[PDB]
Design a protein around this motif. Structure first.
Motif, mmCIF file in Angstrom:
data_model
loop_
_atom_site.group_PDB
_atom_site.id
_atom_site.type_symbol
_atom_site.label_atom_id
_atom_site.label_comp_id
_atom_site.label_asym_id
_atom_site.label_seq_id
_atom_site.Cartn_x
_atom_site.Cartn_y
_atom_site.Cartn_z
ATOM 1 N N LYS A 33 6.464 6.336 2.786
ATOM 2 C CA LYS A 33 5.098 6.623 3.314
ATOM 3 C C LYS A 33 4.037 5.977 2.422
ATOM 4 O O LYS A 33 4.167 5.956 1.215
ATOM 5 C CB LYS A 33 4.971 8.150 3.281
ATOM 6 C CG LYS A 33 4.343 8.653 4.591
ATOM 7 C CD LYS A 33 5.377 9.456 5.385
ATOM 8 C CE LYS A 33 4.675 10.250 6.494
ATOM 9 N NZ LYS A 33 4.713 11.669 6.041
ATOM 10 N N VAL A 34 2.987 5.463 3.009
ATOM 11 C CA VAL A 34 1.905 4.826 2.194
ATOM 12 C C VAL A 34 0.538 5.362 2.636
ATOM 13 O O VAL A 34 0.259 5.460 3.817
ATOM 14 C CB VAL A 34 2.030 3.317 2.451
ATOM 15 C CG1 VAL A 34 1.789 3.003 3.932
ATOM 16 C CG2 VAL A 34 1.001 2.571 1.596
ATOM 17 N N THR A 35 -0.307 5.720 1.700
ATOM 18 C CA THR A 35 -1.648 6.266 2.070
ATOM 19 C C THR A 35 -2.758 5.625 1.231
ATOM 20 O O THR A 35 -2.576 5.330 0.065
ATOM 21 C CB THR A 35 -1.567 7.760 1.760
ATOM 22 O OG1 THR A 35 -1.063 7.940 0.443
ATOM 23 C CG2 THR A 35 -0.639 8.452 2.760
ATOM 24 N N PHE A 36 -3.916 5.443 1.814
ATOM 25 C CA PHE A 36 -5.063 4.856 1.058
ATOM 26 C C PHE A 36 -6.045 5.984 0.708
ATOM 27 O O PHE A 36 -6.415 6.777 1.555
ATOM 28 C CB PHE A 36 -5.701 3.831 2.013
ATOM 29 C CG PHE A 36 -6.982 3.290 1.415
ATOM 30 C CD1 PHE A 36 -6.982 2.748 0.125
ATOM 31 C CD2 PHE A 36 -8.170 3.339 2.151
ATOM 32 C CE1 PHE A 36 -8.171 2.257 -0.428
ATOM 33 C CE2 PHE A 36 -9.359 2.847 1.598
ATOM 34 C CZ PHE A 36 -9.360 2.306 0.308
ATOM 35 N N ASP A 37 -6.454 6.071 -0.532
ATOM 36 C CA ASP A 37 -7.395 7.158 -0.939
ATOM 37 C C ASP A 37 -8.831 6.629 -1.003
ATOM 38 O O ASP A 37 -9.067 5.479 -1.318
ATOM 39 C CB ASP A 37 -6.917 7.599 -2.330
ATOM 40 C CG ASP A 37 -6.301 8.998 -2.247
ATOM 41 O OD1 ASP A 37 -7.046 9.960 -2.338
ATOM 42 O OD2 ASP A 37 -5.093 9.085 -2.090
ATOM 43 N N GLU A 38 -9.790 7.471 -0.709
ATOM 44 C CA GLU A 38 -11.221 7.037 -0.750
ATOM 45 C C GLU A 38 -11.886 7.525 -2.041
ATOM 46 O O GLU A 38 -13.033 7.929 -2.043
ATOM 47 C CB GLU A 38 -11.888 7.678 0.475
ATOM 48 C CG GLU A 38 -11.716 9.202 0.435
ATOM 49 C CD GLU A 38 -12.841 9.867 1.229
ATOM 50 O OE1 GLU A 38 -12.703 9.975 2.437
ATOM 51 O OE2 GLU A 38 -13.822 10.258 0.617
ATOM 52 N N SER A 39 -11.171 7.483 -3.136
ATOM 53 C CA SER A 39 -11.751 7.938 -4.435
ATOM 54 C C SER A 39 -11.225 7.068 -5.578
ATOM 55 O O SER A 39 -11.988 6.521 -6.353
ATOM 56 C CB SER A 39 -11.279 9.383 -4.592
ATOM 57 O OG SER A 39 -12.205 10.252 -3.952
ATOM 58 N N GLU A 40 -9.928 6.930 -5.684
ATOM 59 C CA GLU A 40 -9.344 6.091 -6.773
ATOM 60 C C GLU A 40 -9.331 4.618 -6.350
ATOM 61 O O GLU A 40 -9.443 3.727 -7.172
ATOM 62 C CB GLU A 40 -7.917 6.609 -6.957
ATOM 63 C CG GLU A 40 -7.871 7.581 -8.140
ATOM 64 C CD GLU A 40 -6.581 8.402 -8.078
ATOM 65 O OE1 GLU A 40 -6.263 8.887 -7.005
ATOM 66 O OE2 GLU A 40 -5.933 8.532 -9.104
ATOM 67 N N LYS A 44 -0.957 4.686 -2.644
ATOM 68 C CA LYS A 44 0.136 5.546 -3.185
ATOM 69 C C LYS A 44 1.328 5.562 -2.223
ATOM 70 O O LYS A 44 1.179 5.850 -1.050
ATOM 71 C CB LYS A 44 -0.481 6.941 -3.284
ATOM 72 C CG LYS A 44 0.495 7.878 -3.998
ATOM 73 C CD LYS A 44 -0.017 9.315 -3.914
ATOM 74 C CE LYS A 44 -1.185 9.498 -4.884
ATOM 75 N NZ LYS A 44 -2.101 10.454 -4.204
ATOM 76 N N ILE A 45 2.510 5.265 -2.709
ATOM 77 C CA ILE A 45 3.712 5.275 -1.815
ATOM 78 C C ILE A 45 4.774 6.248 -2.336
ATOM 79 O O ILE A 45 4.927 6.437 -3.530
ATOM 80 C CB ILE A 45 4.259 3.841 -1.810
ATOM 81 C CG1 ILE A 45 4.464 3.345 -3.245
ATOM 82 C CG2 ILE A 45 3.275 2.922 -1.085
ATOM 83 C CD1 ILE A 45 5.752 2.520 -3.337
ATOM 84 N N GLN A 46 5.505 6.861 -1.440
ATOM 85 C CA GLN A 46 6.567 7.830 -1.853
ATOM 86 C C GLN A 46 7.772 7.726 -0.911
ATOM 87 O O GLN A 46 7.865 6.819 -0.107
ATOM 88 C CB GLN A 46 5.911 9.212 -1.750
ATOM 89 C CG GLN A 46 5.403 9.449 -0.323
ATOM 90 C CD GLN A 46 4.504 10.684 -0.307
ATOM 91 O OE1 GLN A 46 3.295 10.572 -0.341
ATOM 92 N NE2 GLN A 46 5.048 11.868 -0.256
ATOM 93 N N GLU B 3 -3.012 7.044 6.354
ATOM 94 C CA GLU B 3 -1.541 7.062 6.082
ATOM 95 C C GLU B 3 -0.795 6.194 7.096
ATOM 96 O O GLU B 3 -1.185 6.085 8.243
ATOM 97 C CB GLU B 3 -1.132 8.529 6.224
ATOM 98 C CG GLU B 3 0.347 8.696 5.858
ATOM 99 C CD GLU B 3 0.548 10.021 5.117
ATOM 100 O OE1 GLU B 3 -0.060 11.000 5.520
ATOM 101 O OE2 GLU B 3 1.305 10.035 4.161
ATOM 102 N N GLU B 4 0.279 5.577 6.674
ATOM 103 C CA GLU B 4 1.071 4.710 7.596
ATOM 104 C C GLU B 4 2.568 4.950 7.380
ATOM 105 O O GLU B 4 2.975 5.526 6.385
ATOM 106 C CB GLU B 4 0.694 3.275 7.216
ATOM 107 C CG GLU B 4 -0.693 2.932 7.779
ATOM 108 C CD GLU B 4 -0.584 1.754 8.753
ATOM 109 O OE1 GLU B 4 -0.410 0.640 8.288
ATOM 110 O OE2 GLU B 4 -0.675 1.988 9.947
ATOM 111 N N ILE B 5 3.385 4.523 8.310
ATOM 112 C CA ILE B 5 4.859 4.734 8.175
ATOM 113 C C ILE B 5 5.595 3.388 8.136
ATOM 114 O O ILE B 5 5.288 2.481 8.887
ATOM 115 C CB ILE B 5 5.263 5.529 9.424
ATOM 116 C CG1 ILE B 5 4.484 6.852 9.471
ATOM 117 C CG2 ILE B 5 6.768 5.829 9.389
ATOM 118 C CD1 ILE B 5 4.551 7.441 10.883
#
Lengths: 53, 53
Positions: A33-40, A44-46, B3-5
């Protein structure tokens, strides 16, 4: 923590060297899973289980 | 946040679709940094200027 250096110059992509793959899991045939943050301002991927239906 | 998959099934690598590239910068010929954290268990990547010497 650990840190590595890389440069984009092929086709806007990354393969992650062996050192990072050694620490993180990254399994062939897994759901990442990959997500984009609006602060840092970083990606981030897990990893997680795998659905099959 | 966004978030993406994605799924690993080529050679342990990722190309990041267009949606993520739309939010993040990712420039061809730039210095990208990647670090592994010992708390969240995720990889964080960012961008910075470019040295030439």
């Amino acid at each position: 923590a650990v840190e590595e250096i890389v440069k984009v110059s092929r086709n806007y992509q990354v393969t992650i060297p062996a050192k990072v793959r050694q620490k993180f899991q990254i399994k062939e045939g897994d759901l990442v899973k990959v997500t984009f943050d609006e602060s840092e301002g970083v990606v981030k991927i897990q990893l997680l289980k795998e659905p099959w239906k």
